[PDB]
Structure formats: C-alpha cells, structure tokens
Amino acid sequence: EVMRPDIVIPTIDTIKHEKIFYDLLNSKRGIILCGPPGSGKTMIMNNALRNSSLYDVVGINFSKDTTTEHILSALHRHTNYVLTLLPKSDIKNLVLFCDEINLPKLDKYGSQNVVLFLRQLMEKQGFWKTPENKWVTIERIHIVGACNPPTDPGRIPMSERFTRHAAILYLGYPSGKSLSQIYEIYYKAIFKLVPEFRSYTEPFARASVHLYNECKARYSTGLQSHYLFSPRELTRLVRGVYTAINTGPRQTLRSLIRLWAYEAWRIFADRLVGVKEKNSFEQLLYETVDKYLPNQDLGNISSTSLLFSGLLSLDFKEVNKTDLVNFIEERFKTFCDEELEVPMVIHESMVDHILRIDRALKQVQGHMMLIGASRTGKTILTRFVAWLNGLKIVQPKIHRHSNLSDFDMILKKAISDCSLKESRTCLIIDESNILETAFLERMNTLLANADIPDLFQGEEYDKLLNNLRNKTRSLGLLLDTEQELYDWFVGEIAKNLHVVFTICDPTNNKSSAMISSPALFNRCIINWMGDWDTKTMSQVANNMVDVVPMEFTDFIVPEVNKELVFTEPIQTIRDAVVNILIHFDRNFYQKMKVGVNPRSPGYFIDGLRALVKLVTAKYQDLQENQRFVNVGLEKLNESVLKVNEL
Amino acid sequence: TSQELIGNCIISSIYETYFGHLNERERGDMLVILKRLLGKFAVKYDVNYRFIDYLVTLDEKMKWLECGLDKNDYFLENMSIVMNSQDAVPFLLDPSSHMITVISNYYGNKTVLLSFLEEGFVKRLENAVRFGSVVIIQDGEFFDPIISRLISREFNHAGNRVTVEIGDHEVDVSGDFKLFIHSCDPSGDIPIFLRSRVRLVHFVTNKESIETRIFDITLTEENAEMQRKREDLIKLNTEYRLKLKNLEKRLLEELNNELMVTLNNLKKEAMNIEKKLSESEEFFPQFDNLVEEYSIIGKHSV
Amino acid sequence: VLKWIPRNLPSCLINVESSVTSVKLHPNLPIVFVATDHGKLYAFDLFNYTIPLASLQSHTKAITSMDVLFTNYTKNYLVIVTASKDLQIHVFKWVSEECKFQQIRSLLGHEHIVSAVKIWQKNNDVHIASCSRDQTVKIWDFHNGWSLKTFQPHSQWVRSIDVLGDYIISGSHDTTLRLTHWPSGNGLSVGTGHEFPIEKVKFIHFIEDSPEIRFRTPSTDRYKNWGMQYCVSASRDRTIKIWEIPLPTLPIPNPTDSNFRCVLTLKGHLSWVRDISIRGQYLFSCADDKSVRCWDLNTGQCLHVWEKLHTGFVNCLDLDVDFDSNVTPRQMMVTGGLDCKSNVFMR
Ligand SMILES: Nc1ncnc2c1ncn2[C@@H]1O[C@H](COP(=O)(O)OP(=O)(O)O)[C@@H](O)[C@H]1O
Ligand SMILES: Nc1ncnc2c1ncn2[C@@H]1O[C@H](COP(=O)(O)OP(=O)(O)O)[C@@H](O)[C@H]1O
Ligand SMILES: [Mg+2]
C-alpha cells in the first residue's frame, strides 16, 4: 500500500490541520493553503476531503492557460440547476479544490479572468450566466485553493481583492520528530516483507530523516537553482526500497544497508553537479551509516561501487562490475547490429548511468529528465535502455516549420498507440523539440496529470471514447460510465507512457524554464551527467588508442607532480599521450572563458579519433619508407659485395 | 624523423579539431601551450613544426589557390581543416560568402547549393544524397532538424548498402556524397546539437589578421624579390625531391634487374640537394629579421 | 532407451578461433560441424578433436544458421546448408571419403541478412527453407536451384522457422508466431503472449510408442489426421511456452479459431533463451545466462541444470533426431557457446 498516493499517516499536525480546515469550511469561508512545494497541501487536502461525510471533491488543477469555462464545466458534472445552483447530493456540500491558483497569468492589463470569477462567486454568492443573462445563485457550494509562494518564478502574485475573502493557512514542513514517526511507519510496512529485520525499522527511518535534513542544509538553492529538497524525496526513497525489496532475493543486513545507500545515492545525489559535492554526499552517507547503523562488513559507498541491477538475473540484486560490463558490451553489440550503429566506448560512468536510467524506466509513471553536456551519451543511452526493457521509442521530428498542430498530432498518435494498442512507449523529448511556451504547457499538462484534456474535444472526444469503449469490451471488462472509461484510460496512460527529457544547455533561459517548471520538477527524475571527469576521459582514451601501434620508440619516464597526472602512473607512451590530451582539453576549456558551463567532450572524442587515424596513416607511411630504404640498402650492400669479391 | 611522429600527430589532430574557431593569436597561444605540455610529459615533437607543411602537400595548396582561396596562411589552415574533416561535417563561417566559389571550383559541376529557407529543400537533398553530389547548404544560422541523422551520421547498414532516415522514409546514400554547411552571420545562434557535431571553422578577418595582412602586403610590395626568391627555392626544392625520388626508383629498378649513368645522375642530384639546402639555410633568418622589422607597422595599423 | 541424460561435466572440449554461432551433428558418423562468427565452417572428430578435419571459409560475414540432412533417394550423401549475413545462402556437400566440403550451389534473392535455414524431404524431392530480414520467407529447391514461393507474414523481420511436409511456422521480431501453409501461402493463425522478440520455433513431433507422453500424443483422430498438435517457442523474455495450434476450417483460416493459445509456460532462465531442441520427453534449451537447462515435458519442471557451462553466452544447442525412425537417436549432445567452446557431452 506504499504506492497509493492517498495513503496518509495520521500525525498530530495532519489532525490539527484537518480540524482547522473543517472549522474554516463550516464558517462559510474560503481557504488558501500556501507553503513550500513539499509541505503536503494536496495530500492533507485530499485526505481531509476524502474521509468527509459532509463535503465532496471537485479536483481541478489550474495552469497558465485557464479560463472560467474549465471551472464551469467542472461544476456541471457535480451541480444541478434548479435560479439556484445546487449540488447533486442532498446532504453533502461541495468543495472546489483549485490546486496552484498562482499559475493563472495576468493579461496585458494586469488581471486574470479566473481569480475574478472566483472572487465573484466567493463574495457576491453567484455569477452571471453569459448566453441568456441570468444570475445563478449559489447557496452551499464551497471553494478552497492551494498555491506555492509567489517568490519563486512561475507563480504570479495575486490580487488582494480575491485573497481578502479567504483565510490563508501556511503549511510548513513537518518537524524532525514527525518525519521520523511517519517514515518509521513506512519502513515498518516495508520490512513486513523481511520478518527477520523488524527491529531495524526505527534506525533506518532516523537515518533517512537525518540524510534529508543534512542534504537540505548543505546543498542549498544558492549553489544551484534545482537543489530543492522536500519530504517527497523521502517518500520516493521508501517507494524505491519497497520496489527493490519486493522483487529481490533474500536480504541480509549488509545487503539492506547497501540497498538503502544505493537508493539514497540515486535519489538525493542524482542532481549534484560538482565532484566536491558528490564527495561530500559520500562522506555524509558514511557518517549517517556510522551513526545510525553501526554495522561492520560494509564496502565502499561510492556510486561506482553500488551497482544494483535486475538485468543479469530474475531478481533485483547487487551484480558484479565485470559481469555487468561484459553483459552491457554484448547487449550493445547486439543493439548496434539490430538498430542504429554508433561507436560507443563502455566505461564505468556509462554503466552507472545505464543502471539508473533502467531503474527509473521500470517504475510505473517513470519519467526522466537528463541534464548534462552535449555528446555525453544521453539520447543513444536512453534508446539502448529502452531497447533492453522493450519500450517502443518514439522521437518527435520537430523542425522550425512546425506549430502546435504537428506536436499535438504526434502526442495524439503516441497516446493512441499507448492505450488502443497496449504498447509501452518511451517518448524521448529534447529541448530543441520545444520552441514556444505552448509546447512546455502541453508537456506540463501531460506530466502533472495523466492526460491532456484539451487535446480531445467534440467529435475527436466522441470517437476516442467510442474506441475506448470498444477496447474495454474487447478485453471483457464491464465498464459503461464515462468516468470509469476515463480513469481507466488515464491509468493506462500513466502505466505505459514514459517521457524522457534531454537538456543540453541548462544555462539557457528556455532550459531554465524547462527545469524550473513545477510539473516537470516534481514528477521527473533528474540525472545530472554534466561534463566528463578525468577518470572517464582516461578510460575512453585508453580504450580508444589501444587499437593502434604507438610503442615503437624509447620513452623516458619523467618525474612529475602527483595531481598533474590523471591516468594510472606512466609506464608506456600511451599513458603520456592520454595525459597530454586530457591536460590540453582542460587548458583549452579553461582559457576560452567558458565559465561554469558544461563542457561537451565532443572535442576530446574527435581529437582521439583524428589522432588514431593520423597515427595509423603516418606509421604506415614511415614503415613503407623504412622497408623501401632497407631493401635498397640490402641491394646496394649485395652489389658492393659482388664488386669487391670479383 | 621517426622519434618525432607521435608528438606531431598529436599536434596535428588537436589543430584539426580544437582550433577551427580561433583567431591567430589564440591559435598561437594554444599551440605554444600544447608544445609546453608535450615537453613536460617527455614526448618529442618537431622543433620547426608548421601545420601546413606537415599535413598538406604543395599540390593541394596550388589546387586551393587556383580555385580561389586567399593567400593568407590562416585561410590555408582553415581550408586544410575543412578538406581533412572526412567524418564531421564541416561548418564554414564566411562574412563575405566567398568559400562557396572555392568549394565549387574544387568539386567542379558536382556541387549543388541549397538553403535552409526553401520549400523543395528536403526533396532535392534526398535526390542529391541518393545520387552522391556534394551539397552546400547556406544560411546555417537557421539549421533545420530534418538532417539530424546526417549531422550525427546515424546510419543503418542495410546489408550491402547504407541507409539514412530523413523525414518519414529511408533514403540511400553514396560513398562520394559530401555535406557542407555555410553560414554568413557570425552573431547567429547555432544550435548546440549541430555545433557540438560539426567541424566549425572561421574564415573571418580579425585585428591579429590585420597585423598579419599588413606584414604580408608590406612584404609583397616593399621587397617582392625576397618573396619570389623564397617561392622559387621552395618550388625548386620540391621538384628536386620528386626528381631524386624518381632517380632512386630508377636505380632500384636497375639494381633489381646504365648503372654507372644512373649512379652519376643520383650523385649529381644529391650534391644539388646539398647545395640547395645549404643555400636555403642562410636565407630563412632574413625573413625573421624582416618580421622583427615590420612589427611597428602592424602595431600602428591595429 | 530415450531416457539418456548427460553428466555434469563435458566429455571433451573444442577450441575455436572465434564465437560459435551454430552446431549440428552428423546423423551417421560421430562428426560435429561447428560454425564461426568469421564465416568459417569447421568439422571436428569426437575422438580426435585436437585438429579440425576441415576448415572452409565461404562467407564474408558471420554465419547465422546451419542445418544438415542425409539424402534419401528411392546415391546417398550429406547436404549442409549454411546461411550468413553476407546476403548469400550456401549449400554444401560433405565428402565422406576425402573429408572435404564441395559446394553444389548457392541460393540468392534476399534483400537483407538471413536468420535461419531448414531442409527437408517429402517424397524423393529435397527442399531448402530460409528466412531473412526482408520480412519474406522464401524456400528453394535443391535440384533446380530456383525459388518456388515467398510470403510476407510479419510487419518486421522473421527470426526462426521450421518445416514439416507443407507447413511452415515462423517466429519473428514483432513477438507474434504465425503458422503458414506453404502451397496456400496464407497464415493459418497468429500468436500472442511473448513480450519480447522470438528466438527459436520448431514443431513438436509425435512418437511411435511410449508409456505416457503429454506433449507428443494426438488426443484425437482429428489431430492424428491433421498431423500437427503442438509447437514450442523461445523468446528474449526469458520464457519458453507451448502453443496449441488451432485447427481452421478444412486450407482456409478460421476467424474464430485463428489464434495461438499458450498451454504450459516454463520459466527459470536468468537471461535470454537462444535455442531449444526436443528429445524423447525432454526439452533441452540453452540461454544467455552461461547455462544449459534440461526441461521435462511431463512434469513441466527442470530436472538438471548445467550452471557456468561457458564463460560467455551459450549460442546454439543441438541433439539427435528422435522422431524419425530413419535417423537413429544416438546419445550425444553438443552445445555451442560464445566463448569459443563447443562442449560435447557423450555417454
Ligand atoms: N504527514 C505526512 N504523512 C505522510 N506523508 C507525508 C506527510 N507530509 C508530507 N508527506 C510526503 O510529502 C509529499 C507531499 O506531496 P504533495 O501533497 O503533492 O505536496 P504539494 O501538494 O505541496 O506539492 C507526499 O508525497 C508525502 O509522501
Ligand atoms: N563512451 C561514450 N560516451 C558518450 N559518448 C560517446 C562515447 N563514445 C562515443 N561517443 C560519442 O557520442 C555521440 C552520441 O551522443 P548523443 O547521445 O547523440 O549526444 P546527446 O547525449 O547530446 O544526445 C556519438 O556520435 C559518439 O561519437
Ligand atoms: Mg503542491
């Protein structure tokens, strides 16, 4: 029951908020909940209205492009016209939950239709109908809303004329004790699967809460704009631990500690951009495990030393590095044989990125958002991973002579293939495929909810529902109501659709709005590959220059500083060549004033390939000249010996 | 000569890849720091290295200069980088839009000029890649992602033939097909997808290039005799090297299967090579003296 | 006599220069025929395996499949059909006296690489089957050397076929099995149930006499008259499934009875299963988990597992033909791995 998003552990803060929320509704007063993005406004909101014997739920989410027509249509499925507007129920009142009311944007004259409509129905107790000029009196229908603070970009500050009629509640973050209790309950539910470790539920929860607190304190927003932490990270940690325990083998204490460390690595430290920050997180994991789980026989807790994968076996267990590398090599050879062919080099970082992408793509509603330098292996790596799991890859062919119609048609085809044909789809979205803000709005609608409602309307809506009913009757499921068909359809879409976002230049404003968008940030899984470190560069260069003859001359090993050589210590000319190429790449990127921008390693790979080809050609020419002069000198020596003999 | 092959290959490959989009001062600074890095890690390079002399021959230089290329060494290096980028599609940045003529003269009638602001652009591009004609695409600032599998070379081998996916259909390729992309506005926004996967070069004229062109012009008109003498010695040395190679091949053929006449010709040729090298050894530092003499004109001009 | 089980260790080991793609057994003499990934066809003696009896390179690219047959004319010899990625199909002949390969003819016509080949004889007429990446299954004649009929049953490329009389089944990359009547050229039924592309499909053949068999016995005189009851498939989803072949209107397909239905599904492979082969009442299979498994038809559970049989993948497996009384079922089994090991199991 840990995958159900409506499961709420009742703590004292939740009960207090439910009580004051009920008291505020019963006073006939609007409610605005404002707080940090992981505070739990929607969760407490839906938990309070779900177990209510007096109020119903009208779940609507506001966007940048929102009109009063959406609100009126959402009322029409729960309200009846008798002039007076009344809910369909006779006893239960109606509550409109409007999530993210800050998202609607002002016009060119600094006002929004939706907030004024809410103010009109919330102060004058009704509204004026447009097509026949009638006043619709509302007598028992309530109204609430939730929003993030307007300090962060994307949240439009809203007029006091509307907020003066609604009581504002600030939902802060839960304290340390509350989080410890909640995830103690969560880990008890998880460890019910493993009965021999029931006594370790409390220290694991305390370790996770301390990890979240330290990660929020250290990696603040001042370093990077996407360093935003929340209890949703802890919930994703619990869900990942469950997903790994459920399909895994029998687990010991060391295996469970390493598994929790792997999940913490893949959730808290996927988005870390610096090597020093990743070292700080590794030290943090060491300190947390030492303080809260004092167990010996624990290996390295580095990212490369924690390789959990279910590809090599029938269960999610910790695989060896060499066997995994061999399996990835053979699978990639088969993939290049059966699909597009590129000359990739298998290094440790690529194996780790394959593992985390495969972990994310195996989750229900598992979307991805990959950030890094160009030519770091994101699109081809996602294609290979989707080929391993059998996901059908759909790539939008968006060019400059395109508009929202072509993108909408591509998305419609993807949705139809996902539902009507029951084929798992891995839609890979690049930042170059998004030109205007409307594409980002469509992607936000697809990610935040499980469907874009504005895509289907009228005759298209009718034929889509007819096809949906035909598909439901084809599988022998007794569904007749429109709500059952619609929520089964959005469940199928949320089950069999994976969207992978590829971002190459996060410094750019378009990619900045792509990352900072609330629907993409709170749903997708960030994976900051960034630029290549010197170890990966050394591995790639050593795997790329070992196929060419380079050791022909004597090479004197010099004396150098320890930190001026990044490759393993120099013994042959290949190590010196690799170190020279890495050093010049670093110097060139440093002296071109690139700043804190990611460094595309395309220059390095192109230089390696050009060096290999040039060394091959030059050594062939030199060997040809050597053979020619040797043959000539031997012939001349034979001739002079014959002359001296006779 | 053999002990200094790896360092020269490293320098030439780095010069081909990294230095496409740098002006002359930054090219010299990066080259001297690369030479310092080679000297630090105990790899021996050529002390008198020159990129044009090492990589391309005199025949290619004469072919480029006859086709319409400028006499500048920066433009010669850029053209050599463009013609040696067999894997990455070269990206030419011409403020004057002149190199289209040079490439057309190099490839003759096989060249086809397209643009990114056309309507039948994609269909004639598919026809050209099916036939195998050299394609030059202008207005590179408005790159259209239809050729994203031609830029990244994401081909699939359909057995005995190679195929690329353009649009919603599979089109064949040819072994002699070459793609060129042309740009005219240096301030245009090149997409990162193309920019990371092309051999971007700069045929621009900068203030350091003003200094070099000022020196070139004052050497051409102030003392033309030294310039034509150096050109004559270079051409004579190349022709004499070819003649010595031909005489060596003839002597090897004679030894394998007259001999005195061939030996006398080889000895006379070798003495002529020695005399020519001795004459040219005492003439090169005069050019360096003239460079040291014509620095104030460059400084005043810039 | 059909209850032979190989021991836990190989009887002998064979060294090859490159990866082994397909292995077949000579049905009269103890000689193996081991293909390579460099197009080379080898031949080793089971008592003298230090040096090959022959080594012929006739394919530019890697050999994809192999199937041998001993000719029965109402002179008798061996016909070895090797298929490869060099766009060609080559038909050989084994010279028993001189231990040499003498090519009879080469068969062309496919637009892409080929995957599997089969050869069978109905009544004094030898035919060679093949499947290719061009989504078309075309068969040839051994004497004429010209194509007879072709058909495209699948949207994507087929991967494995098998033959019996005038019926051809074909697994493919769109995870759908199809059984096509070759003279009619129309698919009788379509398969569904595997989540990954199919690897090897072959017909399940009946037996003459046994105490009890659940998978090779026709349950009715209608099945006996039809001559086909069940078929077995292996695919990249680590599963082996048994399909019941629906019988259409009698050949014209039945809209209400034109779909395969899975009967018994065997699981336990840690990676992709590559090749299968049925012998007696045992379903031998090899996979990519460096192992060879010995399934059982009756109980539906594995009896013997050979863990770590190879360093790399286990590409191909082959045993002797048991269903035909003309070809004796001798007690040798040879496996073929990716790690250049053609292990042979005898006695
Ligand atoms: N008291 C609590 N009990 C259980 N889970 C909680 C509690 N407080 C916060 N959470 C976790 O925090 C997350 C808040 O999610 P959500 O309500 O969507 O935040 P918001 O609505 O502010 O975006 C939930 O996923 C939940 O797992
Ligand atoms: N080991 C490697 N890791 C990453 N990229 C590599 C490796 N080896 C080669 N490449 C280069 O990466 C390119 C593919 O990058 P791609 O994934 O398309 O870039 P992006 O991640 O921006 O989509 C290939 O053209 C290849 O030259
Ligand atoms: Mg929220």
Curated annotation (Swiss-Prot), chain A:
It is found in: Cytoplasm, Cytoskeleton. It comes from the Eukaryota. ATP binds at residues 35-42, 372-379. Residues 334-596 are annotated as: AAA 4. Signal peptide: none annotated. Residues 1-240 are annotated as: AAA 3. Transmembrane segments: none annotated. The dynein complex consists of at least two heavy chains and a number of intermediate and light chains. Interacts with DYN3. Cytoplasmic dynein acts as a motor for the intracellular retrograde motility of vesicles and organelles along microtubules. Dynein has ATPase activity; the force-producing power stroke is thought to occur on release of ADP. Required to maintain uniform nuclear distribution in hyphae. May play an important role in the proper orientation of the mitotic spindle into the budding daughter cell yeast. Probably required for normal progression of the cell cycle. Present with 195 molecules/cell in log phase SD medium. Dynein heavy chains probably consist of an N-terminal stem (which binds cargo and interacts with other dynein components), and the head or motor domain. The motor contains six tandemly-linked AAA domains in the head, which form a ring. A stalk-like structure (formed by two of the coiled coil domains) protrudes between AAA 4 and AAA 5 and terminates in a microtubule-binding site. A seventh domain may also contribute to this ring; it is not clear whether the N-terminus or the C-terminus forms this extra domain. Belongs to the dynein heavy chain family. This is Dynein heavy chain, cytoplasmic. It comes from Saccharomyces cerevisiae (strain ATCC 204508 / S288c).
From Swiss-Prot, chain C:
Its main location: cytoplasm. The keyword Nucleus applies. GO terms for molecular function: dynein complex binding; identical protein binding; microtubule plus-end binding. Signal peptide: none annotated. WD repeats lie at residues 15-54, 58-102, 109-150, 153-192, 205-250, 268-307, 310-345. One of its GO terms (cellular component) is nucleus. It is found in: Cytoplasm, Cytoskeleton; Cytoplasm, Cytoskeleton, Spindle pole; Nucleus. One of its GO terms (biological process) is nuclear migration along microtubule. Keywords: Cell cycle, Cell division, Coiled coil, Cytoplasm, Cytoskeleton, Microtubule, Mitosis, Nucleus, Repeat, Transport, WD repeat. Belongs to the WD repeat LIS1/nudF family. Positively regulates the activity of the minus-end directed microtubule motor protein dynein. Plays a central role in positioning the mitotic spindle at the bud neck during cell division. Targets cytoplasmic dynein to microtubule plus ends, thereby promoting dynein-mediated microtubule sliding along the bud cortex and consequently the movement of the mitotic spindle to the bud neck. Following plus end binding, dynein may be offloaded to the cortex by NUM1. Required for viability in the absence of the kinesin-related microtubule-dependent motor protein CIN8. Self-associates. Interacts with NDL1. May form a complex with dynein. Dimerization mediated by the LisH domain may be required to activate dynein. This is Nuclear distribution protein PAC1.
